[model samples]
Target: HWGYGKHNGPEHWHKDFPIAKGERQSPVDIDTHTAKYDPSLKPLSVSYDQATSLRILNNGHSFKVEFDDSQDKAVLKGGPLDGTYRLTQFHFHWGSLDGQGSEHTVDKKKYAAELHLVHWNTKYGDAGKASQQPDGLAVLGIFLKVGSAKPGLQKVVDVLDSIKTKGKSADFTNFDPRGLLPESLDYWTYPGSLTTPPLNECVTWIVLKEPISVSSEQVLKFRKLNFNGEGEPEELMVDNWRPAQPLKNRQIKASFK
Candidate 1:
């Protein structure tokens, strides 16, 4: 993609996209083996309408969703996770080249790309207050492995015609990000920081092992977007993801089988 290397690469990302260095970054891998037992973390029963309340935006590097707590009335439900954590935004991390694109590395093997469903813990305060509250953000990661083909991803691909260049956007409606989620709701949870700059050490992460299959063609197409507003028109922005960071002393938890 356009932002792959050179002036528009990872080093220049924070400068061009200010929010790229936001307190809440993404792409942290969740390892259940190191997690504490949390019997209460269960999946929420979300509706299509509730999911659509997410405001989709193209931030030059990737397509992201900004949650509107006030309008969407987005509420979190299920088990000990019953408290309301408003949806904030969503985005992706992909490879500069085709073989590797995921932000989280498992056994040193990377997937084609990764998607993030970001939310804020209302326990800290309202959505606005939660944004800066270290304990307020919760990001769900869905891995995308390169495979044969995928019709589900078409929802996003179809919109690319509209957001063809940097700073350009289209009002995406009727599309529920939930559709892009994997069938298995089982997940691994833990505390981690955002993968990008100002990478805050605040987050309750839930990463699913089950990855959705996307065709190599689809992955190549996604890497065709421009990385900067002033860059060449045809420049590709494929590798917008950062490498996986160390788990450090963080503990990752998951639902027991």
Candidate 2:
């Protein structure tokens, strides 16, 4: 009950995390027409290994799939980043209604949902310290649309019942997240921050141009989640997304022409 409501939603986040008003605020609108093509930007390298998948939980915000990032087991490299950033965890942002869930919008277009693969740079020792640096984190944003049933996404859908309420967690083993990506790796890169509170301006955002299709039925499963924990006021974890922020002077670089 402390999130996404009339009392404490995105509009009120800046009160706690002053960085929320920072120049590098995230989920910016990627105007394809205005985005410049950067040949200097290399193709993103996502080399994720299995067995690093730990658990899935609802942290009163978004349900995230955790990973064992002791080493560079699951890592992301190339693109705008100069070094390797190990995969930390992955989460999703969605809406209560269909067709308006995604955080980042391309040319003012929205999708049903969005997936964020959170990673941390190894140069700063660990994620805790790295998160404060400008070049610390690299987040991959993938859009989701409602269409045919995605076989790869079915696994995540089936396990929803296990972690319906906040603080609920379960063992989610060997989940291969690569299957959830779109066929194309083309993306728009920028410097941004975390969408939620304690919004740190450390993320190098890589938002894919293409979207993965999931069934409408599967999206309904996501809305069934509760924002509150057991024995608390029941609040549906719907519309768990922050609206687009100011781009300011930041320029968006596109990998594709």
Candidate 3:
């Protein structure tokens, strides 16, 4: 399986997944000075019913909070999206240390961590089929900073202990991911691909400008997660983020000045 280990990390991904070197690769550096402010960009409309949150699992690659996306109970619209997108899952990426984990860097500055909420356009049917098209996915990237404890994230953190080993999973419901976002919806948008393989170029990236807070201790809890299961030797799940990719000819649009 692909991992952050030196032998099988991001640099080696292209050997199996050629799209890793695709032009529209994700987690690019967001150079604000070069980003154009688009006054025409509409405010993002995000509505997630708490019941839609199904469970949380340690997938070895990362821990994800899966949602019942069979229906549009929770969806995202507006903000550079062409059609309605249903929320499927949300996961995170981080480093072993503070100030180094985020996938997308703002002005070359890396944050403590990054959160991704994956959504697929319902216009193209299911996420699997939608992933093949250019306008099929929309992912929200929220940066995390080390600060005072975040009350909104307590529920998620509390469950980490139960799913510390790879492949471990538990019931996780009634959680509203929106509560974890920052107050301002201001963001930067661009066309990119999934940070992981198959690395399809079907995502509209909407990265929030403001970062939410989490305690340093809370960040360490994430490190406790293992990339290997109980029997295998321990491999810490840190630095699971893809390095910033080339922006190429794409333009980044800002929703606010």
Candidate 4:
């Protein structure tokens, strides 16, 4: 029932979900000056199975690509975890116009859009159960700027034709999410929660320093989607990102100097 409208937006979410006001919430402003460099942090390792991709759907908020997490086919390990975390799904948050969209900001500056690669700890079984534990999930946040069209992202955008409305989905196989990452694995790490509702404080937010550029032509394709369902009024979906939350005693760490 909660959506990013004047009435049900982030400011009002704390009413239904009390943890929305909790400490260690996600999408914090990454102050580059204060983010401490830790040499002990290992390089992040990500391996995604091309065949593990299942489908892509319009979930009324953002179009998400779901993957088969039944096994370790697509997994992320090392980077701030004790074990491997299975890839579950990935989605984006964008604005109605250019210049803003990303959920996380760097020095209070926003990107044209933001991409989230959600993975859950295999140590906790699945996302449902993992969402309850602090170390259960790891979300790789990559900011998207308007520039060149990325082949990996184009593969996904071309499929939006079928899922133009909420709840719409299509079979999508052999799609590797690894293709969607930036060249540099450098990132700022912090303990945070899911940016969306339920607002579960279960995620380790890894915000990448380098961002991949996507063309405005490619991003406009996402604007074609509707937040409204099939029978509902056509409300173009955009600006679905939550505002940055308080750092509140949390330390933001960097993998690179």
> Which candidate tops lDDT?
3
Cα lDDT of model 3 by residue, 1-257, tens digit: 67778898999999989999899999899999999999999999888764379999998899999999988888999998878999999999999999799999999999999999999999998999889999999999999999988788888988999999899999998888877889898999999999988889999999999999999888989988989899999998899999999999899999998
Which pairs clash in model 3? none
Worst 10 contiguous positions by lDDT, candidate 2: 1-10
Give the per-residue lDDT of model 1 (tens digit) for 161-213.
56667777776666667667788877776666666654555666667778888
Question: Which pairs in model 4 have colliding backbones?
Answer: none
Task: Give each model's whole-structure lDDT.
Answer: 0.66, 0.90, 0.92, 0.91
TM-score of 3: 0.98
Measured on C-alpha atoms, candidate 2 has an lDDT of 0.90
What's the TM for model 2? 0.97
Cα-lDDT of candidate 4: 0.91
lDDT of 2 by residue, 1-257 (tens): 23677789888888888888899999899999999999999999989854288999999888999999998898999988899999989999999877788999998888889999999999987998999999999999999999888888888889988998989999998888887889899999999998887799999999999999989899999999999898999888889899899999899999999
Model 3 score (lDDT): 0.92
